[PDB]
Amino acid sequence: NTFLSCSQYHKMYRTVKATSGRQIFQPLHTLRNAEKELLPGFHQFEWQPALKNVSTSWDVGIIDGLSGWTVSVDDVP
């Protein structure tokens, strides 16, 4: 929410930890793992009826928007 960078965060965390005796800012890997729930593609659900010509999975995250183009340079690239 304040656009802070990542190595930024770890340096800041080193600072606050070493400074005053307490663990105030949660470290990196636990941060990412705790965050991973909030992105799309985490929570199992169901659909009645099943959708038309749509995949059955629910875990897939960021799909490449190319949408599976045959890279063959004969067609429009």
Partner 1 sequence: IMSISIRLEGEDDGITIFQEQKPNSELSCRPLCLMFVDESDHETLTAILGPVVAERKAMMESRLIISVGGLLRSFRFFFRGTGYDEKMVREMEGLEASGSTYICTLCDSTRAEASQNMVLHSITRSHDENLERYEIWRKNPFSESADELRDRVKGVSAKPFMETQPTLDALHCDIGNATEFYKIFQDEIGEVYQKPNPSREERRRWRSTLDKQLRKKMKLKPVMRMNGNYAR
Partner 2 sequence: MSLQPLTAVNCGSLVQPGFSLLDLEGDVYLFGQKGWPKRSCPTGIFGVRIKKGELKLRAISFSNNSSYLPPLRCPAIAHFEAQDGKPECYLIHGGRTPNNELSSSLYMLSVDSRGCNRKVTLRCEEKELVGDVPSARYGHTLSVINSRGKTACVLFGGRSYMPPTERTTQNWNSVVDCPPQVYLIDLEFGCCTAHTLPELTDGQSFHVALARQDCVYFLGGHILSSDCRPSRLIRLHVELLLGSPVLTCTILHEGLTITSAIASPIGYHEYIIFGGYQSETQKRMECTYVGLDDVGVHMESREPPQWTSEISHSRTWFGGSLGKGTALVAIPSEGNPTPPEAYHFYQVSFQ
Specify the stretch interacting with partner 1 by CB under 8 A; choose among 2-10, 21-29, 30-38, 46-54: 46-54
Q: Is 60 one of the binding residues for partner 1 (CB under 8 A)? A: no
Q: Can residue 54 be called a binding residue for partner 1 (CB under 8 A)?
A: yes
- Integer-rounded Cα radius of gyration of the chain: 21
What the block records as the tokens of 9 is 């965060």
The Cα–Cα gap between 29 and 6 comes to 11
Question: Which of 27, 58, 66 minimizes the C-alpha distance to 42?
Answer: 58
Q: Which of 4, 38, 50, 73: binder of partner 1 (CB under 8 A)?
A: 50
- The SS3 assignment for 64 reads coil
Q: 23, 57, 67, 70: which one contacts partner 1 (CB under 8 A)? A: 67
Summarize as ranges the residues that interact with partner 1 (CB under 8 A).
43-54, 65, 67, 76
